[PDB]
């Protein structure tokens, strides 16, 4: 039983009926998935992402990722169709709540010269997306046993209908805004 999930349905779940006037308890927003991908564009050359971009997201998120292939060829990017260019992991259920705790508690203040996250990064429906620096911040990968550094970007997908309905939800979970 992860601590962020039980803290959600103890006081976060009740507080959103006061900030927003819902008439039914099924309308209360809830984060449904957290999607993480590297997006390794330097894999159209050198063919080394199995050792470096799969062995680290397995350690960060818990489960092995999916290798994503290119949909169309681009001549300017030195790319084909069906070429491994992206590496995605999807987090559901109870491993989502443990990743959102472990991101906001011990990970996210290890960004070099960290000052916050911006609250204008909503897509219009209530789904936040930020990005990170490198194979730093997460302790589960070590800095000594790795290849070249590479960053990622993290989606957070809610059931909220609008923007600030998802801003009030992630402020309560523990995303630092400004």
């Amino acid at each position: 039983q992860p601590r962020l999930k039980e803290r959600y349905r103890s006081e976060i779940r009740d507080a959103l009926r006061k900030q927003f006037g819902y008439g039914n308890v099924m309308q209360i927003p809830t984060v449904t998935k957290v999607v993480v991908n590297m997006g390794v564009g330097e894999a159209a050359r050198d063919a080394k992402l199995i050792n470096g971009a799969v062995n680290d997201l397995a350690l960060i998120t818990g489960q092995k990722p999916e290798v994503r292939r290119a949909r169309k060829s681009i001549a300017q990017f030195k790319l084909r169709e069906g070429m491994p260019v992206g590496v995605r992991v999807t987090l559901r259920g109870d491993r989502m709540w443990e990743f959102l705790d472990r991101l906001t508690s011990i990970a996210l203040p290890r960004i070099r010269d960290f000052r916050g996250l911006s609250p204008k990064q909503f897509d219009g429906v209530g789904n936040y997306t930020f990005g990170l620096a490198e194979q730093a911040v997460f302790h589960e990968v070590d800095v000594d046993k790795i290849d070249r550094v590479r960053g990622m970007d993290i989606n957070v997908v809610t059931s909220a209908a609008t923007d600030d309905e998802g801003r009030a939800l992630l402020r309560a979970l523990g995303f630092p805004f400004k």
Partner: protein, 57 residues
């Protein structure tokens, strides 16, 4: 496919230098992830030319 391809993800205790500690589930072997900065001992979680001419004179 949720069998013997995923890495080891067992329960884990994390301590901090401040004294805050909690228990989650991570991939670190031994359950001994130790941080030096956390969500309570970090800043931002807890907080002209005219004035320099006067300071010279």
């Amino acid at each position: 496919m949720k069998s013997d391809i995923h890495p080891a993800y067992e329960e884990t205790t994390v301590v901090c230098g401040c004294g805050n500690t909690f228990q989650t589930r991570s991939t670190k072997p031994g359950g001994r992830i130790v941080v030096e900065v956390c969500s309570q001992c970090h800043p931002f979680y807890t907080g002209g030319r005219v004035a320099r001419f006067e300071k010279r004179y």
